[PDB]
Design a protein around this nucleic acid. Sequence first.
RNA 1: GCUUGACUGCGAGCGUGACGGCGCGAGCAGGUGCGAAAGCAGGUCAUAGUGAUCCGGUGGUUCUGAAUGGAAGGGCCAUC
RNA 2: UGAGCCUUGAUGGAAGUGUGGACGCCAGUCUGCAUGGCUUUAAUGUUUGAUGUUCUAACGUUGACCCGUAAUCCGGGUUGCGGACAGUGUCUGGUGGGUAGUUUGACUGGGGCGGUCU
RNA 3: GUUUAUUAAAAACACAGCACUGUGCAAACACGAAAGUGGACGUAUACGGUGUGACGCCUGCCCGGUGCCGGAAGGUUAAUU
RNA 4: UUUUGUAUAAUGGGUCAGCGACUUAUAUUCUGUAGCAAGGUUAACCGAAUAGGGGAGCCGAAGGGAAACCGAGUCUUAACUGGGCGUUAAGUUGCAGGGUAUAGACCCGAAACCCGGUGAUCUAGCCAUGGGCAGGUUGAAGGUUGGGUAACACUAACUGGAGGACCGAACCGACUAAUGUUGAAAAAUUAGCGGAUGACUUGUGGCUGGGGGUGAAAGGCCAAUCAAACCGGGAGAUAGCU
RNA 5: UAAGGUGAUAUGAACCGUUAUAACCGGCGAUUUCCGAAUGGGGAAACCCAGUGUGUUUCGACACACUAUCAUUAACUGAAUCCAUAGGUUAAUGAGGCGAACCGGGGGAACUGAAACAUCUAAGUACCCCGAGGAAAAGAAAUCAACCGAGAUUCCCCCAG
Lengths: 70, 149
Amino acid sequence: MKKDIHPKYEEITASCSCGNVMKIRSTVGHDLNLDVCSKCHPFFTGKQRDVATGGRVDRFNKRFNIPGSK
Amino acid sequence: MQVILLDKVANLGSLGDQVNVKAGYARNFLVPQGKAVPATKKNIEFFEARRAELEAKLAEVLAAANARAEKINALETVTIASKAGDEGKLFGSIGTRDIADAVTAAGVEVAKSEVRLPNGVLRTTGEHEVSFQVHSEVFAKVIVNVVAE
RNA sequence: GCUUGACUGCGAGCGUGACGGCGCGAGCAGGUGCGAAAGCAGGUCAUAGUGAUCCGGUGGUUCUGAAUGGAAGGGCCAUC
RNA sequence: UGAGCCUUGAUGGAAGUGUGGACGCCAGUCUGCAUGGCUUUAAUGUUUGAUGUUCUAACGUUGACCCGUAAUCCGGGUUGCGGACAGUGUCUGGUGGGUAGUUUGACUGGGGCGGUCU
RNA sequence: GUUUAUUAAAAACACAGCACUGUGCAAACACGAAAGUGGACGUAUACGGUGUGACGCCUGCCCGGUGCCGGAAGGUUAAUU
RNA sequence: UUUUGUAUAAUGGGUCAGCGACUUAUAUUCUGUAGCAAGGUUAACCGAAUAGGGGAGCCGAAGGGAAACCGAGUCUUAACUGGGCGUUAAGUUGCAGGGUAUAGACCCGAAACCCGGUGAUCUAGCCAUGGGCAGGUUGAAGGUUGGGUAACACUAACUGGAGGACCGAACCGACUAAUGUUGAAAAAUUAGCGGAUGACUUGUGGCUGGGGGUGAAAGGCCAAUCAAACCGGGAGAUAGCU
RNA sequence: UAAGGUGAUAUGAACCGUUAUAACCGGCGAUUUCCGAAUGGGGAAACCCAGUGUGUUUCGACACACUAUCAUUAACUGAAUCCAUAGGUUAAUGAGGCGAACCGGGGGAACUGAAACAUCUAAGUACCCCGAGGAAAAGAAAUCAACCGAGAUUCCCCCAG
Ligand SMILES: [Mg+2]
Ligand SMILES: [Mg+2]
Ligand SMILES: [Mg+2]
Ligand SMILES: [Mg+2]
Ligand SMILES: [Mg+2]
Ligand SMILES: [Mg+2]
Ligand SMILES: [Mg+2]
Ligand SMILES: [Mg+2]
Ligand SMILES: [Mg+2]
Ligand SMILES: [Mg+2]
Ligand SMILES: [Mg+2]
Ligand SMILES: [Mg+2]
Ligand SMILES: [Mg+2]
Ligand SMILES: [Mg+2]
Ligand SMILES: [Mg+2]
Ligand SMILES: [Mg+2]
Ligand SMILES: [Mg+2]
Ligand SMILES: [Mg+2]
Ligand SMILES: [Mg+2]
Ligand SMILES: [Mg+2]
Ligand SMILES: [Mg+2]
Ligand SMILES: [Mg+2]
Ligand SMILES: [Mg+2]
């Protein structure tokens, strides 16, 4: 639902089988929290994968300079 | 797989590893409160200043301490008689003081902790050799002589 | 006894089917076998022993191949 | 405890008496240690896959305490217990009338049973 | 005692009792995409599910089939590399 | 009307009046007719708008072969023969009509499926808070006392007052028969009947929603509707049937 | 603008007007109870109850006026914990609800057809949810072409059933 840093997902899709299922699929990603900011100290964001790995090449700061600004 | 400890802690690295390090291990422990690391351009170069400024010594510091053998060699003969007497021996004690202190007979001063002579000097009056040993990197040469009075 | 006509490419003209299709077939071309030779042989005395299409598999061919040369893939022929 | 590189070994400081592991076509040699004057393969370094140990630091806590607060919620903090487990997301083998969508032929002296569909 | 309001009141449902089975509490199980709630402000003398249906005397043989419970050495076997 | 066949006692219509069913769009092909002719014709658009302009493009004058390719020929085959298909058939664009195609496609009609809302003022459960039960009967446990036991048990009376206890109005329910059956009544009336301090009965308000609820279980109940409620929508569902 | 005129079902009464502020029409205003986003709190909608300020006050009162919630910023206050934050107060802006269709987007059937039915169809249609405009959306090539070149998106006719 979140993965805040990055968008998210929760888009639907149909999970076909052998030929076809007109069913539906959805909810993905995950969560976690408690991220230590070099500054004061951690607010627990509920990012997920692709969100967690993002806080790496990036920052922790710029990775937050948005969930604030905008 | 890329960090910079600097503050080694049982890790296969000291002063910060510049080559493949552990990963995910620092995301929550090492980096937080422990030894921050980000071996990413920015932080990297910034460490060089913390080290390259330590090596400038071999170039600069060595120089501010190597002129020793050069600053003191042409020295005028050290004329510090060590109370030569006793039917052919001496009275003065030749050990550490007269060796080094033989320089401020005009002004300049040194440190008695730089002498280079394994055996104590036989209490003679001859050409007392004094191999000034300021630093391992640079050695110098001094002399000492005793006179009669 | 000798052999491989259970041949390859076509086919006058017919029979029989709503149709898909099925059957008969002299004669022609290339090469065969058997016979001294005329000649006979395009599987079994004849009539049952069978499965359309699609999707594909295998071999053959410069038919095609999305800028061009190839290639994949498609066609065509043979067959599962 | 496996395996990759490959690091040090056995095939392809000067005599004698001895101890150990090696295998046999077997009658034997191999090989460390005192006194005496490249591959077949083993160990250490390792890289990496396995089980199993313990730790805290992600993660859980429907334990306690402190604030927000004269809240049983929630959040922060301290502390305890659990701990790379649990649990979640993606993928994947089970199971799955719990639910869902359907199929379940015709001929026939009614239909059904039987029989037959070329 | 209950039931087909409006053709069936019964021998049917329920019942107390019995038995099997599950559940160590954030219980099993149920409602719910989740949070949360019920179970229960209970905690195995408790709660659930199944069958039998006071009480009396009892409740025999079969584990081949299916299901369930335990084992899991060996065979077969997914994603993955 | 439907049938082999109907005066048929097979179907439909009490009667009258008004309404009531082969349409429409574009595409394709024939026929008639008109224009032009190996040529016919424009589309959108422009526009001094039904003109005129615009020939993008569509069709035909060439066909054969799977195609490259060849071409009144061409495929077939090694074949130069034969055989298949072609070759001195005028087409094309409107207009009106016959048919077809895509559409609701002559008209009327299902039982149903799916989507979103409205419903627990009936009823089924449950929650909270209040109310009701004339009278008469039986008479358990406990106790007091006498007896009696070393002490109890045991017993006798008296007191006591239990119970999904008894009889029976209210109240609740519905076993039987008659009547009603275009009723007084879309389930009742009359005479009997069962329970009636209990798993009782009732007022008020609240909570469970449709594949969902509730259910001492009958597929019962969820507003005279229930093997999946009502309302609106997909919707002119589909109807080889009448 | 003007001789009439006081809306309609019915006059009638009592009247206003004829010159130029009587009507009547058009523009800008003033007023505009209660409910309704409803916003001071509650509420079975048009009702009930309060706090804090006010004027006239025969100086109890009447009514009036403000006081919802979020977001941005401002300043002031401010926990566990020095700090700092969390939180709190105030104030100025702003939002909130309606709305026919077209439009972007999130979620998404089934009847139906296939002369059965699962692939497939119906159709990304119905519907439900969010958002914005006067249009929205798209848009100046990591486009296409074929060795020639064209030159953002959009809409129309062709290519072609
Ligand atoms: Mg025969
Ligand atoms: Mg079923
Ligand atoms: Mg269906
Ligand atoms: Mg039949
Ligand atoms: Mg009874
Ligand atoms: Mg009944
Ligand atoms: Mg009855
Ligand atoms: Mg029974
Ligand atoms: Mg008849
Ligand atoms: Mg008749
Ligand atoms: Mg008429
Ligand atoms: Mg011919
Ligand atoms: Mg009774
Ligand atoms: Mg009767
Ligand atoms: Mg009666
Ligand atoms: Mg009674
Ligand atoms: Mg009620
Ligand atoms: Mg009903
Ligand atoms: Mg439809
Ligand atoms: Mg209809
Ligand atoms: Mg109000
Ligand atoms: Mg209000
Ligand atoms: Mg069908």
